[PDB]
Each structure stands twice: as structure tokens, then as C-alpha cells.
């Protein structure tokens, strides 16, 4: 919910700095990722509604133990708000931030053999919307720069024309590029249109609307942070400033 509300690249990258990797892990068993299932949608039909489960969902799913699964669970967290179940990860990795996992060599994860086409198929890319695809390309770019496989990032972009057009433009090592970005990456937010409490058919759509309606309640809750009315009550670290910079970069 908090990750899906990040609109700018600066806000999203700042959130990935604070958030430890444990929030990407789910600790819940879930079910098998790819499976044809019959679900109940009684607001529209009496007959059970066919659907196919996918990794990009608001629910836990079983994920492979290797480094491939860990990367996929991070991306699924960013684009869907919920991760996967990867059992028995060391405490050292779980306390590290998500950005450190994607952009640092200190962690023991080896990602040099990652294939971007295989990952994009597993985390179904034909099903994502434009904002979800932009968030995925941010994660791919961070992995490429840490690994030195910046050419593999470009070949992947050239094989898919629509992804190249919407690919976010920033340098993972320069903060000036992040500030200049005008991309909008907010999956959930305050809706200009009228949003009702009705259910939706697909698992992805119904799960997304749950996050959308939850954010509106979170918007009007006391936990939400109103800058225009309580800016002096905020700690100096968390206050909005023009000179705010990520570690390194």
C-alpha cells in the first residue's frame, strides 16, 4: 500500500532505502503460482468465475528458493504490494534494504546470470499496466548497473518496442537524474473518478481495488501525514527538503 502510493522516482527510491527485505517476503504459504482455478464472484454471476492465478497479485504465492525467486519477490512487492514465500532466508539478507539488495555488492547474492526475458515472462508482463511495467524496468536497470550488464538491459529494451518508449530515464548512480524525472508511478492514489465499493472479476483487478479503497481509508486516517498542516511537527530527517540525497549516488 505504501509502496504503491509512491508517485515520483525520488519517493519510490527513498522508500526502497528505508524498507528492509523482510517486507518483500510474506511468510505465508500461499498456493501454486500458475494454476487454472474457479472462483466465486456472486455480484455478477451465479456460475463460478474461471481465472488463472499469477505471481503479480496481492496474495502470497510459492516461490523458488534461488536468487531468481528473491528478485521476483522484490519486483512483485513493488508492482503488486505483496511478495512471495521463500523459506529460510538468512537474517543478514532480511535486515538489508531492498535498494541494497538490488544495487550493492556487499550482499552475497550473485545475479550476473539473470535473464531479463525469463523474469518478465514469469512475472507476467502482458498482464501488467503501464505504471507496473515502469516500476519493473526500474528494478531491471538497478540490477544491470550493479552487475555491469548494461548492454543486456539495452538488448532487452530493443527487442520490445513498447517497453523502450516507456522506460524510465535515470542513471542509477547520479541523483541529479532522479530529481529531473517527471514519470508518474502511482498505482494507488486519490481517484479523480468516482470509486465505489463494488467487487471486480479478475483476481488482479479485485485485489488492486482492495488496495485502492484501503489507501482512501488510509488517506483519511490519523496515520496519514499532512505536510501543509503539520510540517513543523515532522522530524528533520523526514521533512521534505530540496537537498535530500540517497546514500551514495
Amino acid at each position: 500500500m505504501d509502496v504503491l502510493s509512491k508517485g515520483s522516482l525520488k519517493e519510490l527510491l527513498a522508500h526502497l532505502e528505508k524498507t528492509p527485505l523482510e517486507e518483500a517476503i510474506s511468510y505465508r504459504i500461499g498456493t501454486v503460482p500458475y494454476q487454472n482455478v474457479l472462483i466465486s464472484r456472486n455480484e455478477y454471476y451465479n456460475q463460478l468465475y474461471p481465472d488463472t492465478t499469477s505471481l503479480i497479485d496481492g496474495v502470497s504465492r510459492e516461490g523458488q528458493r534461488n536468487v531468481n525467486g528473491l528478485i521476483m519477490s522484490i519486483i512483485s512487492y513493488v508492482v503488486s504490494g505483496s511478495g512471495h514465500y521463500i523459506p529460510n532466508i538468512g537474517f543478514m539478507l532480511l535486515r538489508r534494504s531492498i535498494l541494497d539488495i538490488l544495487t550493492k555488492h556487499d550482499t552475497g547474492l550473485v545475479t550476473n546470470n539473470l535473464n531479463y526475458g525469463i523474469i518478465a515472462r514469469n512475472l507476467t508482463v502482458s498482464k501488467m499496466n503501464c505504471e507496473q511495467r515502469k516500476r519493473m524496468l526500474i528494478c531491471f536497470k538497478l540490477l544491470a548497473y550493479k552487475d555491469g550488464n548494461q548492454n543486456d538491459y539495452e538488448i532487452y529494451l530493443n527487442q520490445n518496442i513498447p517497453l523502450k518508449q516507456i522506460a524510465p530515464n535515470f542513471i542509477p548512480g547520479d541523483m541529479r537524474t532522479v530529481i529531473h524525472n517527471q514519470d508518474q508511478l502511482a498505482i494507488v492514489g486519490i481517484p479523480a473518478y468516482r470509486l465505489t465499493q463494488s467487487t471486480e472479476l479478475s483476481i488482479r483487478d479485485d485485489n488492486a481495488k482492495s488496495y485502492k479503497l484501503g489507501y482512501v481509508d488510509w488517506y483519511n486516517s490519523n496515520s496519514f501525514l499532512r505536510e501543509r498542516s503539520e510540517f513543523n511537527l515532522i522530524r528533520l530527517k523526514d521533512r521534505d527538503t530540496k537537498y535530500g540525497k540517497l546514500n551514495g549516488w
Binding site: 530515464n169 524525472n181 517527471q182
Partner: protein
């Protein structure tokens, strides 16, 4: 040279100066780079949209 000074200032966002090359300013760099990206898809797109 006032008409040239005013025209160069609008194009380059910087006043013309002697002992300088008069490159064209930020606008020249952007035009040069977008031409590179238009020719083929292998060229990088490194001009911010802002």
C-alpha cells in the same frame, strides 16, 4: 549587433561573449542528441523530457 545578441540569447539562454566559441547553448546539445536517437534505435536517448 543588438539584433544578433537578442536572437542568440533566446536560442542559447546565454549572452554572446567575445573570446568564446558561441556553440549554441543548451538548445544545440538537445537538437544534436535527438538527431542521434532518431536515426536508429541503438542510439541512447539521454535528453531529459524536462
Amino acid at each position: 549587433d543588438v539584433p544578433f545578441v537578442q536572437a542568440y540569447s533566446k536560442f542559447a539562454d546565454d549572452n554572446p561573449r567575445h573570446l568564446r566559441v558561441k556553440t549554441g547553448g543548451k538548445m544545440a546539445n538537445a537538437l544534436t542528441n535527438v538527431i542521434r536517437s532518431y536515426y536508429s534505435i541503438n542510439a541512447p536517448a539521454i535528453v531529459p523530457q524536462v
